């Protein structure tokens, strides 16, 4: 409703992940306060230009990694981004594997996701008197996947078409005994703390939203389980290559989704009781 | 403790779900409030006569569904049958099906349930310090599902004798990777949203409790995916069938329930410490 | 930080579960008061002298078990062992059984779990600025594991050497269908609700913590499923063998954890962001 300076609006969003908490990516950055009814978002949302279409920059975790997955103010989050009037989000994660040929600094497009959070609060923006219930069964936004999987095949990174995403509560990673669980029972190829409910309310927003994953390590399968500082040390190692697909795809995003390629577009049309 | 009117009771109380906001059934209403230690009700409570019976009616999402799934008041919902004195309690619900011959339009009377729930809150009333952990393996009401069989039978619909509920969190429903999960992995039958901690309650609360549950989609299994809008249709296109069943069904509840086929009728005896 | 009274210190802790409300086995006990950032831990923890070792006892329940695991200030818990300046905490807990050879009245000490709470509020404590993702890959401490099972072996006790407990939230007992995907589908070994968040505090405040688990049934498995009672009366029909453990093994901790025996001794070393 509000912004912080007046006026700002913006066509592409691009939440940042581990690693990812300046835009570098932006031409003539505007920071911007954005009212939301859930409080304060993240951080200041970065307004700017990528080649003559506006971008918003949020990074989820604040600048210098301030907020936890269990502590994100995910509605806020969403809520700002869809009030700069963006279309398509584009969420840059970093994820553990549990397959041996999804290896560190190759990159993952998702398709599918099982949530096995528990203290995210808060799962959706409709808590009555209009009840939503909207249809995931194809979460993530195709047409953007689609332009992911070119852009990374184009530079030459490898670049996994599909995969299940298991999002856990953490903080603490998973024990040998759940990993299994994921890996063998379950059958998730990846595995990460923030998707959810971030999907879940991008999806009720109407905004065409997908995930650009970079596998950071194997989860507690190799000779040494996953500590944090890998994690982060492997981002940062690998950020410019996500910021070059980032420079890639934004330009071609100056139009709309297309709505047979856009699951959530149209949610609210089915949803609302 | 305190009603308006005061000194209302009631014998068989029915929980209605989604397309069932109006008792339609009762005669002689009266809309009740029942002061609950937990706040309000989803709704007053409607005590009218079936055929010589008291029945209590209460609209679990209000009504004109008001209230979703994780912010019903379920605490107070039951507080509020129980002091009106009920001994049973139906449920009236929409479920998805996970196998192709519990088609929609059947009714299901299931005998387990696998609680995947995550946002509820309050999973009991006990939380000291007299600790109580009520047994749950056969969590229905034997009594009262027999009861649903017959009347189904005689009256000439589809029941289905047994099925395991999977309850979600929700408001979204669910992806196409979770329900294999559902299906594939944990062999569940039917899937919703409400059943727990509605029925944990109950058991505390020493109420002989049921399900009658309809099929209204196939989850994401058919060439659509549910949506919100087809579950309400569904339903609503059925609900006569549904009140034929109650109204064959609550003259017979005159009595009270049989101890030795109510697994939840002295659950305390043992339970608490 | 404040301690009443005043400078009270504490070298091994014990958590005691059900049926464990009184230390029994402390010399010279004094009740204490800790101050926690996070409110009252479950009860006085009484500190007191076990051959020269200074042990402080902490009931989780609460003495007259008051606090079912859903409300248990795991925080508060943790934190005031830590203030003490403890360095080993063993937890002796009862548990369920999801396999036959593993029998009311027989030991455990695990080596995996899996968690499978929903509703315990606070599963870390680093809520920011600085994000704490600690490896549980192996959760246990190694170094008390193996002391608690040649303990158990030198008195001729049966005392299992590994297992996976499957931490439910509670405090209704598992359904039917729950147990099996426990048993069938996740191969877990034990079932209890009180492991988790403890054992995640623990971790995260670089302490050597076990669990001496105690089989007090077979959940939904036999003839009669679990009750609260038969729970209560099997841990106190065998507190005594519980308590010759601990006298063993308290002595035989007057030093230090090794570091290549405990995972979680240097957790934050690299685990801090
Ligand atoms: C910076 S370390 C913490 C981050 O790692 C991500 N992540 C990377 N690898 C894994 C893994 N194996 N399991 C869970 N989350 C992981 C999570 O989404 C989290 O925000
Ligand atoms: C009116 S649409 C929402 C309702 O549908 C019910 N339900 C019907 N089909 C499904 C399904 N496939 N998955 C989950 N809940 C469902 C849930 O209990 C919820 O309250
Ligand atoms: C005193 S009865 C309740 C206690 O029993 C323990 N427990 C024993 N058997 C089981 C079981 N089968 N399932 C879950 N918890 C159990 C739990 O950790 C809880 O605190």
């Given at each position: ?19 990812l908490?300046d835009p570098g990516i932006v ?30 920059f ?181 950020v410019e290559?996500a910021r070059?697909?980032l420079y ?26």
């Open positions: 409703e509000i912004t912080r300076p007046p006026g700002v609006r913006a066509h592409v969003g691009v939440i940042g992940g581990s690693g908490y031409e003539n950055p505007v920071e911007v306060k954005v009212s939301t009814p859930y409080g304060n978002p993240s951080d200041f949302i970065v307004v700017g230009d990528v080649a003559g279409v506006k971008v918003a949020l990074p989820r975790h604040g600048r210098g990694h301030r907020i936890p997955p269990h502590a994100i103010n995910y509605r806020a989050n969403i809520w700002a981004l869809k009030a700069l009037g963006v279309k398509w989000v584009i969420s840059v994660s970093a994820v553990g594997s549990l397959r041996e040929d999804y290896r560190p600094g190759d990159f993952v497009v998702p398709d599918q996701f099982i949530d096995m959070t528990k203290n995210r609060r808060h799962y959706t923006f409709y808590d009555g008197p209009v009840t939503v219930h909207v249809s995931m069964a194809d979460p993530f936004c195709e047409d953007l996947r689609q332009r992911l999987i070119d852009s990374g095949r184009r530079l030459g990174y490898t670049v996994h078409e599909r995969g299940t995403y298991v999002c856990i509560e953490g903080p603490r990673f998973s024990t040998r005994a759940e990993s299994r669980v994921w890996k063998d029972v379950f059958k998730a190829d990846i595995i990460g703390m923030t998707l959810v409910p971030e999907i879940n309310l991008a999806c009720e927003a109407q905004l065409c939203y997908a995930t650009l994953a970079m596998v950071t390590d194997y989860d507690v399968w190799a000779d040494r389980p996953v500590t944090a500082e890998e994690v982060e040390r492997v981002m940062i190692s690998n290559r070059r697909m890639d795809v934004i330009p071609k995003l100056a139009g709309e989704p297309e709505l047979e390629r856009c699951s959530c577009c149209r949610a609210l049309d089915t949803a609302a009781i």
